Coordinates of C-alpha atoms in Angstrom, one line a residue:
Chain A
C1 CA 7.6 10.7 -31.0
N2 CA 5.4 8.6 -28.5
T3 CA 7.7 8.9 -26.2
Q4 CA 8.7 12.9 -26.2
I5 CA 4.7 12.6 -26.0
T6 CA 5.6 10.7 -22.5
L7 CA 7.6 13.1 -21.3
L8 CA 6.2 16.3 -22.9
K9 CA 3.0 15.0 -20.5
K10 CA 5.2 14.3 -17.6
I11 CA 6.3 17.9 -17.9
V12 CA 2.6 20.0 -18.5
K13 CA 1.2 17.6 -16.2
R14 CA 1.5 19.9 -13.0
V15 CA -0.2 22.7 -15.4
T16 CA -3.2 21.0 -16.1
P17 CA -2.6 20.1 -19.8
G18 CA -5.5 20.3 -20.5
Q19 CA -9.2 21.7 -19.4
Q20 CA -9.9 25.7 -21.2
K21 CA -6.0 27.3 -21.3
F22 CA -5.0 24.8 -23.9
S23 CA -5.9 26.2 -27.5
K24 CA -2.2 26.4 -29.7
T25 CA -0.3 23.4 -27.6
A26 CA -3.7 21.4 -28.6
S27 CA -3.6 22.3 -31.8
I28 CA 0.2 21.5 -32.4
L29 CA -0.1 18.0 -30.6
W30 CA -2.9 17.1 -33.3
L31 CA -1.3 18.2 -35.9
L32 CA 1.8 16.0 -34.8
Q33 CA -0.4 13.0 -34.0
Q34 CA -1.8 13.7 -37.6
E35 CA 1.6 13.9 -39.1
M36 CA 2.3 10.5 -37.4
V37 CA -0.9 9.1 -38.6
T38 CA 0.4 10.0 -41.6
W39 CA 3.4 9.1 -41.3
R40 CA 2.2 5.2 -40.8
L41 CA -0.2 5.6 -43.5
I42 CA 2.1 6.7 -45.9
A43 CA 4.7 3.4 -44.6
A44 CA 1.9 0.8 -44.9
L45 CA 0.5 2.0 -48.2
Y46 CA 3.7 1.7 -49.9
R47 CA 4.5 -1.4 -47.9
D48 CA 1.7 -2.8 -49.6
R49 CA 2.2 -1.0 -53.4
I50 CA 5.7 -3.0 -52.8
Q51 CA 4.6 -6.7 -52.2
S52 CA 2.4 -5.9 -54.5
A53 CA 4.8 -4.8 -57.4
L54 CA 6.9 -8.1 -56.7
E55 CA 3.7 -10.5 -56.6
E56 CA 1.9 -9.1 -59.9
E57 CA 3.1 -12.2 -61.5
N58 CA 0.3 -13.7 -59.8
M59 CA -2.8 -12.1 -61.5
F60 CA -6.5 -12.8 -63.2
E61 CA -8.0 -15.9 -60.9
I62 CA -11.4 -17.0 -61.0
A63 CA -13.4 -18.4 -58.1
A64 CA -13.5 -22.3 -57.5
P65 CA -16.5 -24.5 -56.2
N66 CA -15.6 -27.3 -53.3
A67 CA -13.3 -25.0 -51.9
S68 CA -12.2 -23.7 -48.2
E69 CA -13.0 -19.8 -47.0
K70 CA -9.2 -19.4 -46.6
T71 CA -8.6 -20.3 -50.4
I72 CA -11.9 -18.1 -51.5
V73 CA -10.4 -15.3 -49.7
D74 CA -7.1 -15.8 -50.9
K75 CA -8.1 -16.0 -54.8
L76 CA -10.4 -12.8 -54.0
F77 CA -7.6 -11.2 -52.7
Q78 CA -5.5 -12.6 -56.0
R79 CA -8.1 -11.2 -58.4
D80 CA -9.7 -7.9 -57.1
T81 CA -7.2 -4.7 -56.6
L82 CA -9.2 -2.1 -54.5
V83 CA -9.6 -4.8 -51.2
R84 CA -5.8 -5.0 -50.7
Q85 CA -6.4 -0.9 -50.0
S86 CA -9.2 -1.6 -48.2
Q87 CA -7.7 -4.4 -45.7
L88 CA -4.7 -2.6 -45.3
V89 CA -6.7 0.6 -43.9
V90 CA -9.2 -1.6 -41.9
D91 CA -6.2 -3.5 -40.2
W92 CA -4.2 -0.2 -39.5
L93 CA -7.1 1.3 -37.6
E94 CA -8.0 -1.4 -36.2
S95 CA -4.1 -1.6 -35.0
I96 CA -4.3 2.7 -34.2
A97 CA -7.5 2.0 -31.9
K98 CA -6.1 -1.7 -30.2
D99 CA -2.5 0.5 -29.5
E100 CA -4.8 3.8 -28.2
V101 CA -7.1 1.0 -25.8
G102 CA -4.2 -0.5 -24.4
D103 CA -5.3 -2.8 -21.5
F104 CA -8.8 -2.4 -21.0
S105 CA -9.3 -5.9 -19.1
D106 CA -7.3 -4.4 -15.8
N107 CA -9.5 -1.1 -16.1
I108 CA -13.1 -3.3 -16.9
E109 CA -12.0 -5.2 -13.5
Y110 CA -10.7 -2.0 -11.1
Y111 CA -14.4 -1.2 -12.7
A112 CA -15.8 -4.3 -11.7
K113 CA -18.7 -5.4 -13.7
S114 CA -20.5 -8.4 -14.0
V115 CA -24.1 -9.8 -15.1
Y116 CA -26.2 -9.7 -11.5
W117 CA -25.9 -6.2 -9.6
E118 CA -26.7 -4.6 -6.4
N119 CA -30.3 -4.0 -7.1
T120 CA -31.2 -7.3 -8.6
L121 CA -29.2 -9.3 -5.5
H122 CA -31.1 -7.3 -2.8
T123 CA -34.3 -7.7 -4.5
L124 CA -34.0 -11.5 -4.2
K125 CA -33.1 -11.7 -1.1
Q126 CA -36.2 -9.4 0.1
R127 CA -38.0 -11.8 -2.1
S128 CA -36.4 -15.0 -0.8
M129 CA -36.9 -13.6 3.4
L130 CA -40.1 -11.9 3.2
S131 CA -42.5 -11.2 -0.4
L132 CA -42.0 -7.4 -0.9
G133 CA -41.7 -7.2 -4.8
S134 CA -40.1 -3.7 -4.4
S135 CA -39.0 -1.7 -8.1
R136 CA -39.8 -4.0 -11.1
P137 CA -40.9 -7.2 -10.9
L138 CA -38.6 -10.5 -10.4
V139 CA -39.7 -13.8 -11.2
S140 CA -37.9 -16.6 -10.0
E141 CA -38.9 -19.8 -11.7
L142 CA -35.2 -21.7 -9.6
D143 CA -33.3 -19.1 -11.1
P144 CA -33.2 -15.3 -11.6
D145 CA -33.8 -15.8 -15.2
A146 CA -36.8 -16.1 -15.9
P147 CA -37.4 -11.9 -16.9
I148 CA -34.1 -11.8 -18.5
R149 CA -35.8 -14.6 -21.0
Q150 CA -39.2 -12.9 -21.4
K151 CA -37.4 -9.8 -22.1
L152 CA -38.9 -7.6 -19.4
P153 CA -38.2 -4.2 -17.9
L154 CA -35.6 -3.9 -14.9
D155 CA -34.9 -1.3 -12.2
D156 CA -32.9 1.7 -13.7
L157 CA -29.7 1.3 -10.9
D158 CA -29.5 -2.4 -13.9
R159 CA -30.0 -0.5 -16.8
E160 CA -27.2 2.2 -15.9
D161 CA -25.1 -0.6 -15.3
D162 CA -25.9 -2.6 -18.7
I163 CA -25.1 1.0 -20.5
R164 CA -22.1 1.4 -19.1
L165 CA -21.1 -2.7 -19.6
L166 CA -22.2 -2.3 -22.9
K167 CA -20.6 0.8 -23.5
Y168 CA -17.7 -0.7 -22.4
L169 CA -18.6 -3.1 -24.8
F170 CA -18.3 -1.0 -27.7
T171 CA -15.1 0.5 -26.8
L172 CA -13.6 -3.2 -26.9
Chain B
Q1 CA -1.3 -47.5 0.3
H2 CA 0.6 -44.1 1.3
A3 CA -1.8 -42.0 0.0
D4 CA -5.1 -42.7 2.0
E5 CA -2.3 -42.9 5.2
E6 CA -0.7 -39.3 3.9
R7 CA -4.7 -38.2 4.0
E8 CA -5.5 -39.4 7.3
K9 CA -2.3 -37.8 8.2
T10 CA -3.1 -34.6 6.8
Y11 CA -6.2 -34.4 8.2
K12 CA -5.2 -35.4 11.8
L13 CA -2.3 -32.0 11.7
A14 CA -5.5 -29.7 9.9
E15 CA -7.2 -30.4 13.4
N16 CA -4.4 -30.2 15.5
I17 CA -4.1 -26.6 13.5
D18 CA -7.2 -25.3 14.8
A19 CA -7.1 -26.6 18.0
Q20 CA -3.7 -24.9 18.4
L21 CA -4.7 -22.1 16.4
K22 CA -7.7 -21.4 18.8
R23 CA -6.1 -21.6 22.1
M24 CA -3.0 -19.5 20.7
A25 CA -5.0 -17.2 19.6
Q26 CA -6.6 -17.0 23.2
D27 CA -3.3 -16.9 24.8
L28 CA -2.5 -13.6 22.2
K29 CA -5.9 -12.1 23.7
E30 CA -4.9 -12.8 27.6
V31 CA -1.7 -11.6 27.2
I32 CA -2.0 -8.6 24.9
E33 CA -5.1 -7.8 27.8
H34 CA -2.0 -8.5 30.6
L35 CA -0.4 -5.2 28.5
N36 CA -2.6 -3.5 28.6
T37 CA -3.7 -3.1 32.3
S38 CA -0.1 -3.4 33.0
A39 CA 0.9 -0.6 31.0
Chain C
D1 CA -16.6 -14.4 10.6
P2 CA -14.2 -15.4 8.1
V3 CA -14.7 -12.0 6.0
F4 CA -13.0 -10.4 8.5
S5 CA -9.8 -11.2 7.5
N6 CA -6.1 -10.1 6.6
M7 CA -5.4 -6.9 8.0
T8 CA -2.6 -5.5 5.6
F9 CA -2.7 -2.0 5.4
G10 CA -1.1 -1.1 1.4
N11 CA 0.7 -3.0 -0.8
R12 CA 4.2 -3.4 1.6
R13 CA 3.9 -5.7 4.3
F14 CA 2.2 -4.0 7.3
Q15 CA 0.6 -5.3 9.6
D16 CA -1.8 -4.5 13.0
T17 CA -2.8 -4.9 16.4
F18 CA -5.3 -7.4 16.8
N19 CA -8.5 -7.8 14.8
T20 CA -11.6 -8.7 16.4
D21 CA -12.5 -8.7 20.2
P22 CA -15.2 -9.9 21.9
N23 CA -14.5 -8.3 25.2
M24 CA -13.6 -4.8 26.3
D25 CA -10.2 -3.8 24.7
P26 CA -9.3 -0.5 24.0
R27 CA -8.2 -2.0 20.0
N28 CA -11.7 -1.8 19.6
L29 CA -11.7 2.2 19.7
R30 CA -8.7 2.3 17.5
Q31 CA -10.9 -0.6 15.3
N32 CA -14.4 -0.7 14.5
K33 CA -17.1 -1.5 17.6
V34 CA -18.0 -4.4 18.6
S35 CA -21.9 -4.0 17.7
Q36 CA -23.1 -4.1 14.0
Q37 CA -26.0 -1.5 15.1
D38 CA -23.3 1.4 15.0
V39 CA -22.1 0.1 11.9
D40 CA -25.9 0.1 10.7
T41 CA -26.5 3.2 11.5
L42 CA -23.4 4.8 10.1
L43 CA -23.8 3.4 6.8
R44 CA -27.7 5.0 6.7
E45 CA -26.6 8.3 7.5
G46 CA -24.2 7.8 4.7
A47 CA -26.8 7.4 2.6
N48 CA -29.1 9.5 3.8
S49 CA -26.2 12.4 3.6
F50 CA -25.4 10.7 -0.3
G51 CA -28.8 13.2 -1.5
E52 CA -29.0 14.2 -4.9
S53 CA -27.6 17.9 -4.3
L54 CA -23.9 15.9 -3.3
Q55 CA -24.2 13.8 -6.0
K56 CA -25.2 16.1 -8.7
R57 CA -22.3 18.5 -7.2
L58 CA -19.5 15.3 -7.3
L59 CA -21.1 14.7 -11.0
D60 CA -20.2 18.7 -12.1
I61 CA -16.7 18.1 -10.3
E62 CA -15.7 14.9 -11.8
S63 CA -16.9 16.6 -15.4
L64 CA -14.8 19.5 -14.9
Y65 CA -11.6 17.9 -13.4
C66 CA -10.2 14.9 -14.3
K67 CA -7.0 14.4 -12.0
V68 CA -3.2 15.9 -12.7
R69 CA -0.7 13.6 -12.3
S70 CA -0.4 9.6 -13.4
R71 CA -2.5 6.9 -11.8
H72 CA -5.0 5.6 -13.8
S73 CA -8.9 7.3 -13.9
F74 CA -10.7 5.7 -11.4
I75 CA -13.1 8.8 -10.3
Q76 CA -16.6 6.7 -12.1
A77 CA -15.1 2.9 -10.2
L78 CA -14.2 4.9 -6.9
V79 CA -18.2 6.8 -6.7
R80 CA -20.2 3.9 -7.8
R81 CA -18.1 1.7 -5.5
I82 CA -18.3 5.1 -2.3
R83 CA -22.2 4.5 -3.3
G84 CA -22.3 0.9 -3.5
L85 CA -20.6 0.1 -0.2
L86 CA -22.9 3.2 1.7
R87 CA -26.2 1.9 0.3
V88 CA -25.3 -1.9 1.2
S89 CA -24.8 -3.5 5.0
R90 CA -22.6 -5.3 6.7
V91 CA -22.7 -8.9 8.1
Chain D
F1 CA 16.6 18.3 12.2
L2 CA 13.2 18.1 13.2
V3 CA 13.6 15.5 15.8
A4 CA 16.3 17.4 18.1
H5 CA 13.8 20.9 17.6
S6 CA 10.9 18.7 18.0
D7 CA 10.2 21.2 21.2
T8 CA 10.1 24.7 18.9
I9 CA 8.4 22.6 16.4
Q10 CA 5.3 21.1 18.2
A11 CA 4.9 24.7 20.1
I12 CA 4.4 26.1 16.8
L13 CA 2.0 23.2 16.0
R14 CA -0.1 23.6 19.4
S15 CA 0.4 27.7 19.7
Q16 CA -2.1 28.9 17.2
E17 CA -3.8 32.6 16.1
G18 CA -6.2 34.5 14.0
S19 CA -3.5 36.4 12.5
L20 CA -2.2 36.1 8.8
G21 CA 1.4 34.6 9.1
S22 CA 0.1 32.2 11.9
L23 CA -1.9 30.0 9.3
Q24 CA 1.1 30.3 6.7
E25 CA 3.8 28.9 9.2
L26 CA 1.4 26.0 10.3
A27 CA 0.8 24.9 6.8
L28 CA 4.3 24.8 5.5
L29 CA 4.9 23.0 9.1
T30 CA 2.4 20.3 8.5
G31 CA 3.6 20.0 4.5
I32 CA 7.5 19.6 5.8
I33 CA 5.9 16.7 8.0
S34 CA 4.2 15.0 5.2
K35 CA 6.8 15.1 3.2
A36 CA 9.5 14.2 5.7
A37 CA 8.6 12.3 8.5
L38 CA 5.8 9.2 7.5
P39 CA 5.9 6.0 8.9
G40 CA 5.7 4.5 5.0
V41 CA 9.4 6.8 5.1
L42 CA 10.5 5.1 8.0
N43 CA 9.7 1.5 6.5
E44 CA 11.4 2.4 3.1
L45 CA 14.3 4.2 4.0
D46 CA 16.9 4.6 7.4
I47 CA 15.4 1.3 8.0
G48 CA 19.3 -0.3 9.2
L49 CA 19.8 2.6 10.9
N50 CA 19.1 2.4 14.8
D51 CA 15.8 1.1 15.4
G52 CA 16.1 2.8 18.4
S53 CA 16.6 5.8 16.8
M54 CA 13.9 5.0 14.1
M55 CA 11.6 4.8 17.6
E56 CA 12.2 7.8 18.4
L57 CA 11.5 8.9 14.9
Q58 CA 8.5 7.4 14.7
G59 CA 7.3 8.6 17.8
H60 CA 7.9 12.3 17.0
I61 CA 6.1 11.3 13.8
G62 CA 3.0 9.9 15.6
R63 CA 3.2 13.2 17.3
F64 CA 3.1 15.8 14.8
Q65 CA 0.5 13.0 13.7
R66 CA -1.8 13.7 16.5
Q67 CA -1.3 17.2 16.1
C68 CA -2.1 17.5 12.1
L69 CA -5.0 15.9 13.2
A70 CA -6.4 18.7 16.0
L71 CA -5.6 21.1 12.6
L72 CA -7.4 19.9 10.8
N73 CA -10.2 19.5 13.0
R74 CA -9.6 22.9 13.9
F75 CA -9.5 24.6 10.7
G76 CA -12.2 22.1 8.6
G77 CA -15.2 24.6 9.7
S78 CA -16.6 26.6 6.8
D79 CA -17.4 28.8 9.4
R80 CA -14.1 29.5 10.7
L81 CA -13.1 31.2 7.4
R82 CA -15.2 33.7 8.3
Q83 CA -14.3 33.5 12.3
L84 CA -10.7 34.4 11.5
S85 CA -11.1 37.0 8.4
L86 CA -12.3 39.4 11.3
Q87 CA -9.4 38.4 13.3
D88 CA -7.0 39.6 11.1
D89 CA -9.2 41.9 8.5
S90 CA -7.1 45.3 8.6
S91 CA -9.4 47.2 6.6
Chain E
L1 CA -31.7 -29.8 12.4
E2 CA -28.5 -28.1 10.6
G3 CA -27.5 -32.2 10.0
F4 CA -30.8 -32.5 8.2
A5 CA -30.6 -29.2 6.5
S6 CA -27.5 -30.3 5.0
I7 CA -29.2 -33.4 3.8
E8 CA -32.0 -31.8 2.1
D9 CA -29.8 -29.4 0.4
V10 CA -27.5 -32.1 -0.7
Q11 CA -30.7 -34.1 -1.9
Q12 CA -31.8 -30.6 -4.0
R13 CA -28.7 -30.5 -5.8
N14 CA -28.0 -34.1 -6.1
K15 CA -32.0 -33.8 -8.4
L16 CA -31.7 -30.7 -9.7
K17 CA -28.4 -31.4 -11.3
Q18 CA -30.4 -33.0 -14.0
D19 CA -32.5 -30.2 -14.5
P20 CA -31.2 -26.8 -16.7
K21 CA -33.3 -24.7 -14.5
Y22 CA -30.5 -24.4 -11.6
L23 CA -27.4 -24.5 -13.2
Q24 CA -26.2 -20.6 -11.9
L25 CA -27.6 -21.6 -8.2
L26 CA -25.1 -24.8 -8.5
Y27 CA -22.4 -23.1 -9.8
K28 CA -22.8 -20.5 -7.4
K29 CA -22.8 -23.8 -4.6
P30 CA -20.0 -24.4 -2.7
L31 CA -18.2 -28.2 -3.9
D32 CA -17.1 -29.0 -0.2
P33 CA -19.2 -26.3 1.8
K34 CA -17.1 -27.7 5.5
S35 CA -13.9 -28.2 4.1
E36 CA -14.0 -24.2 2.3
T37 CA -15.4 -23.1 5.5
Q38 CA -13.0 -24.2 7.6
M39 CA -9.9 -23.7 5.7
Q40 CA -12.0 -19.8 5.4
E41 CA -12.2 -19.9 9.4
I42 CA -8.1 -21.3 9.5
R43 CA -7.1 -18.3 7.4
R44 CA -8.8 -16.2 8.9
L45 CA -7.2 -17.5 12.1
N46 CA -4.2 -17.1 11.3
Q47 CA -4.0 -14.0 9.6
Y48 CA -5.2 -12.0 12.6
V49 CA -2.6 -14.0 14.6
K50 CA 0.1 -13.2 12.2
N51 CA -0.7 -9.7 11.9
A52 CA -1.1 -9.1 15.7
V53 CA 1.9 -11.1 16.6
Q54 CA 4.4 -9.1 14.0
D55 CA 3.1 -5.3 15.3
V56 CA 3.7 -6.6 18.5
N57 CA 7.1 -8.4 17.8
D58 CA 7.9 -4.8 16.1
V59 CA 7.1 -2.8 18.9
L60 CA 8.6 -4.8 20.9
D61 CA 11.8 -4.8 19.2
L62 CA 11.8 -0.7 19.0
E63 CA 11.3 -0.8 22.3
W64 CA 14.5 -3.3 23.0
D65 CA 17.0 -1.0 20.4
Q66 CA 15.8 2.5 22.0
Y67 CA 15.9 1.0 25.7
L68 CA 19.6 0.1 24.7
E69 CA 20.4 2.9 22.7
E70 CA 19.5 5.0 26.4
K71 CA 21.7 2.3 28.7
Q72 CA 24.5 2.7 26.5
Chain F
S1 CA 49.7 -15.1 15.5
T2 CA 52.4 -15.2 18.0
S3 CA 50.3 -15.3 21.1
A4 CA 48.3 -18.3 21.2
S5 CA 46.6 -16.8 24.0
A6 CA 45.5 -13.6 22.0
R7 CA 44.0 -13.9 18.5
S8 CA 40.1 -14.2 19.4
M9 CA 41.0 -10.9 21.7
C10 CA 43.4 -8.9 18.9
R11 CA 40.1 -9.6 16.4
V12 CA 37.9 -8.2 18.7
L13 CA 40.0 -5.3 19.3
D14 CA 40.5 -4.9 15.3
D15 CA 37.2 -4.6 15.3
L16 CA 36.2 -2.7 18.1
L17 CA 38.8 0.1 16.3
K18 CA 36.9 0.5 12.5
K19 CA 34.4 2.2 14.7
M20 CA 36.8 5.4 15.0
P21 CA 35.8 8.5 13.7
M22 CA 38.4 10.2 10.9
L23 CA 36.5 13.1 10.4
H24 CA 33.5 12.0 8.3
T25 CA 32.4 14.9 5.7
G26 CA 29.3 14.2 4.9
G27 CA 28.5 17.3 3.0
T28 CA 29.9 19.5 5.5
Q29 CA 31.7 19.9 8.8
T30 CA 29.2 17.7 11.0
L31 CA 29.8 16.8 14.6
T32 CA 26.9 15.1 14.8
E33 CA 28.4 12.2 12.7
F34 CA 32.0 12.7 15.2
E35 CA 29.7 11.8 18.8
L36 CA 27.8 9.1 16.8
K37 CA 31.1 7.4 16.3
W38 CA 32.5 7.7 19.0
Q39 CA 29.1 6.6 21.7
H40 CA 29.0 3.4 19.4
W41 CA 32.9 2.9 20.0
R42 CA 32.1 3.2 23.9
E43 CA 29.2 1.0 23.8
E44 CA 30.9 -1.6 22.0
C45 CA 34.3 -1.4 24.1
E46 CA 31.5 -2.0 27.4
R47 CA 29.3 -4.3 26.0
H48 CA 33.1 -6.2 25.2
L49 CA 34.1 -5.6 28.7
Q50 CA 30.8 -6.9 29.7
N51 CA 30.4 -10.4 27.5
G52 CA 34.2 -11.8 28.3
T53 CA 35.5 -11.1 25.2
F54 CA 38.1 -8.2 26.5
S55 CA 38.4 -9.6 30.3
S56 CA 40.4 -12.5 31.3
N57 CA 43.7 -11.1 30.6
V58 CA 45.8 -8.8 32.2
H59 CA 47.4 -6.9 29.1
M60 CA 44.2 -6.0 27.2
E61 CA 42.5 -5.0 31.0
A62 CA 45.8 -2.6 31.5
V63 CA 44.8 -1.5 27.5
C64 CA 41.2 -1.1 28.0
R65 CA 41.7 1.0 31.8
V66 CA 44.0 3.1 29.7
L67 CA 41.6 3.3 26.8
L68 CA 39.0 4.1 29.3
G69 CA 40.4 7.4 30.2
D70 CA 42.1 8.0 33.1
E71 CA 44.3 9.9 35.3
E72 CA 46.3 7.9 37.8
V73 CA 47.7 5.1 35.8
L74 CA 48.8 7.4 32.2
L75 CA 50.9 9.1 35.7
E76 CA 51.8 5.9 36.3
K77 CA 52.6 4.9 33.1
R78 CA 54.3 8.6 32.4
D79 CA 57.0 6.9 30.1
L80 CA 54.9 6.4 26.8
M81 CA 53.6 9.9 27.1
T82 CA 55.6 13.2 27.0
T83 CA 54.7 16.0 29.0
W84 CA 51.9 18.1 29.7
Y85 CA 50.3 18.8 26.2
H86 CA 50.6 15.0 25.2
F87 CA 48.8 14.4 29.1
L88 CA 46.3 16.8 27.7
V89 CA 45.8 15.4 24.4
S90 CA 46.0 12.0 25.7
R91 CA 42.9 13.1 27.6
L92 CA 41.2 14.7 24.9
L93 CA 41.7 11.7 22.4
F94 CA 40.1 9.4 25.1
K95 CA 37.3 11.4 27.3
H96 CA 35.6 12.9 24.8
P97 CA 35.2 12.7 20.9
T98 CA 35.8 16.7 20.3
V99 CA 36.2 19.7 22.4
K100 CA 34.9 23.3 22.1
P101 CA 37.1 26.3 22.1
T102 CA 35.4 27.4 25.4
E103 CA 36.7 24.1 27.6
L104 CA 39.8 23.6 25.2
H105 CA 41.5 26.0 27.9
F106 CA 39.9 24.5 30.7
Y107 CA 40.8 21.2 29.9
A108 CA 44.5 22.4 29.6
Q109 CA 44.2 23.9 32.5

């Protein structure tokens, strides 16, 4: 189905596979995506159900002190029964999100995002050359970190760049 | 030890590389100028 | 300057004639000029032309259209890189 | 074929009017040149079939590129649209 | 004055290496500035010479083959 | 293999004869390929004759002089050819890559 979706994208890519002139086709596409999601959820849930039916001989546990987090989560998994489906859905949706993201490192490298920005670099260069405090104040105690430490406001360009960086971090 | 000898040889080789690249770039510039003024 | 290195055009092995000529040469007419003031004036004129109207136009264009082929979405990256390279100066 | 008939091709590229079919013919010629006459195309394919023939190929390609640049500089103005509309406006 | 400037810069770097208010600048500063500048200049000159001579040799070979096919 | 002073000569002759045009079909009947093959054959023959790998031997020199396309040499060696049609086809083979019906009658005359 993924191969067929890629082929259909390569086909309809010459007549705008989106925009506004794409109603019933987009509906069929989203229905097929939901069908694939339901199939994957069914597969995962029934695999977990078969595993639980096979390991049903190990049940009725208790919390034991002086142990490690691995043994703690193991005994919690053996005791509780809803944590099974909870972590199953969690891992399934995490894998779905990872597959939808793909390779974001190359996208970030092409977008070129870092800590220091052009506005901050120009402000530092101007303050090192002359004494013109343009935009927000940027004091430097032998290192451009005093405003970041004191939680001082910055420029609009730096603010929007940080907003985009945090949006990318949230997407990751 | 052959380490210090190799390091000195590499330094001399880099110096010769620079001194030869300078004159080679000058010669290429002169040759291209002559070709442009002749053609 | 070491910043003006390399001359490969494209992913393939392509070459170009010369790079920087301190004297008057016809290759300087094909490449950049021999004066930094010309590049500075070009960058200043580009930054002056890249006003709020053109920025809003490009934003509306990128919002109403998002490519049509397969080449990875780089619209915002190109926009920000062009803005930075137009507002920065060359050394 | 374009190199063999480069006389009439270049003549058509250099002769332009304010009619209707002339612009379409120039557009088709420019598209054919851009699709089947490129230095990258020459470097990719046919690179091992007489470089002298390939030399004439890239020479005609450069001539076609100069003609295309001239046509772009001529038709790149917004007022050219209304200037040419009055030449073919039958009614 | 460049020698005194480099000596003062080296002294300031050696003094601020133990200070926590110069770590970013110390990391941004090159380890071997003279060697790095020499390497950058050598690489730039080599790339320029290579590109120029390769383009010229390609043009010369194309003209050679053209004249050969025209004469024979 | 027989004559000791002709191994490289016959090798060069065989390498030159490989450029003969046997009616190529790259999609349809095209004369450009035939003309290019004939020009390449003539250029290779001239290059060999100027270098010397096809010289310094009376037999191969006479062979090359015949293949170049002459008239008095063929009139002298008429014992090989047949009659006027053989002379005409020999001329058309050793002088031009291909001919048109507008000039075929002129060449035959």
